[PDB]
Amino acid sequence: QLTEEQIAEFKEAFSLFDKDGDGTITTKELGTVMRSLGQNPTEAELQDMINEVDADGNGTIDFPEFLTMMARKMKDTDSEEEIREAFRVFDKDGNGYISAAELRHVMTNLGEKLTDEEVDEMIREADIDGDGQVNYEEFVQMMTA
Amino acid sequence: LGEDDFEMFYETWEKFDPDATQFIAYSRLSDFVDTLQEPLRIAKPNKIKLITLDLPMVPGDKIHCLDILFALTKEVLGDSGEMDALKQTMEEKFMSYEPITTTLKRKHEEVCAIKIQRAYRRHLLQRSMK
Ligand SMILES: [Cl-]
Ligand SMILES: [Cl-]
Ligand SMILES: [Cl-]
Ligand SMILES: [Cl-]
């Protein structure tokens, strides 16, 4: 299910960190490859991934194994906590609020950009008080219900 | 690496920043660094490379000419005294810059944005069936 663009990114990231041109990265390098891709898994999450499929204990991973590991992790859709955490990167105060205008910018400037129609409805549904502020913890609870 | 490469750098830079604003859109950077000649060039595919370079970005998602130069320069030379000396030297010769993010943080921001976008789209799809 991985997109072609994702594969190109994975190939570039992996190759970028394959120090030896050996076709394999080290399990320790895995977290850095993942950060180069925008993913910030915790040490525990990283260990879980490193532990699985490095049965031999050699300490390396090749590109087929990375794709398989990558495909598994990303296919399962995000929990509510993950979504909440996603909002927090954009919350300058860590207070659970982002301005509607800032939310609109992020939504249309990055990623799988929302259309005009989509972002307008997002703001209608998120700025429930019409005060230019979004309490995103409430909005994520609504959106995932 | 000598005057030839730097002279080439700004000749290429002018094509991308004709009004001499000293900034280039992040979205054009991959093309910019691919267009340079070696060794400063970073050939395509270079999107993840540029992320790893952790370049400062200013409002409107723009990156300053010197931050790019220094990064490309350090890429070839390394973290050395000459590199440090050259940078300070070059900055003086070259001579409002306010960073709100970096190319590295921005890739994580993209990933987080996508989680939100996909959740919202799922929400819209669920609403329309119920
Ligand atoms: Cl070998
Ligand atoms: Cl959920
Ligand atoms: Cl412009
Ligand atoms: Cl590229």
Author numbering:
A (entry chain B): 3 to 147
B (entry chain A): 1612 to 1706, 1714 to 1748
Q: Please, what does the article write about this entry?
A:
Voltage-gated Na+ channels (NaVs) rapidly activate upon membrane depolarization to allow passage of Na+ ions into cells. DIV is followed by a C-terminal tail which contains a structural domain (CTerm, NaV1.4 residues 1599–1754) consisting of a five-helix EF hand-like motif (EFL, helices αI–αV) followed by a long α-helix (helix αVI).
The 1.8 Å resolution structure of NaV1.4 CTerm Long in complex with apo CaM (Rwork/Rfree = 20.3/23.4) contains one complex in the asymmetric unit (ASU) of the cell. The NaV1.4 CTerm contains the 5-helix globular EFL (αI–αV, residues Glu1614–Met1706; residues 1599–1613 not observed) followed by a long helix (αVI, residues Leu1722–Lys1748). The apo CaM C-lobe is in a semi-open configuration, and bound to the IQ-motif of helix αVI with a buried surface area (BSA) of 872 Å2. The apo C-lobe contacts appear to be anchored by two NaV residues which are in the C-lobe’s hydrophobic pocket: Ile1734 (120 Å2 BSA) and Tyr1738 (119 Å2 BSA). The CaM C-lobe also forms four Glu–Arg salt-bridges with helix αVI: Glu114–Arg1736, Glu120–Arg1739, Glu123–Arg1745, and Glu127–Arg1745. Its surface contacts the CTerm in such a way that CaM helices A and B of the N-lobe contact helices αIII and αVI of the CTerm burying 495 Å2. The similarities between the NaV1.4 and NaV1.5 CTerm complexes with apo CaM, in both conformation and binding affinities (NaV1.5-CTerm Long Kd = 48 nM) and the equivalence of the response of both isoforms to apo CaM binding (i.e., increased activation) suggest that the conformation of the NaV1.4-apo CaM crystallized here corresponds to an activating conformation of apo CaM bound to the NaV1.4 CTerm.
